[PDB]
């Protein structure tokens, strides 16, 4: 239960954490994401999305333009760690990745990256 987190994504375009800290001895870590609310996928669409700070912005932009069809991911992106598919209300999706893909010192970011969402909906990531 330390080496998971439930995050909520509203109708209202917000994650309900902006932080997240990883336990280093932690060999996987998952990640559990629901959607309250009552808008589809199409409109209010989320997913978890993770990468470094610094690849936040380029997935963020590829991912706008690969579609809806493409969960608003460039398909392949090895600039992705992790990330769930992308659900509308009532849905629920997890992702577990494995702990070892993070380094200690390096700032990671979580997002969506349905069109417009990562203004508000981001949040650091931290592996201690
Ligand atoms: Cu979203």
Not at 45 to 65: E, F, I, K
Not at 73 to 95: C, F, Q, Y
Not at 104 to 118: A, R
Request: proline share 3%.
């Amino acid at each position: 239960a330390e080496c998971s987190v439930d995050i909520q994504g509203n109708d209202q375009m917000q994650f309900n954490t902006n932080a997240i800290t990883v336990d280093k001895s932690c060999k996987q870590f998952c990640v559990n994401l629901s959607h309250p609310g009552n808008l589809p996928k199409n409109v209010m669409g989320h997913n978890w999305v993770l990468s470094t700070a610094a690849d936040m912005q380029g997935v963020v932009t590829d991912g706008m333009a690969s579609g809806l069809d493409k969960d608003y991911l460039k398909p392949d992106d090895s600039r992705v760690i992790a990330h769930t598919k992308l659900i509308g209300s009532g849905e629920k999706d997890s992702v577990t990745f494995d702990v070892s893909k993070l380094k200690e010192g390096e700032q990671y970011m979580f997002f969506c990256t349905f069109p417009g969402h990562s203004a508000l909906m981001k949040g650091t990531l931290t592996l201690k």
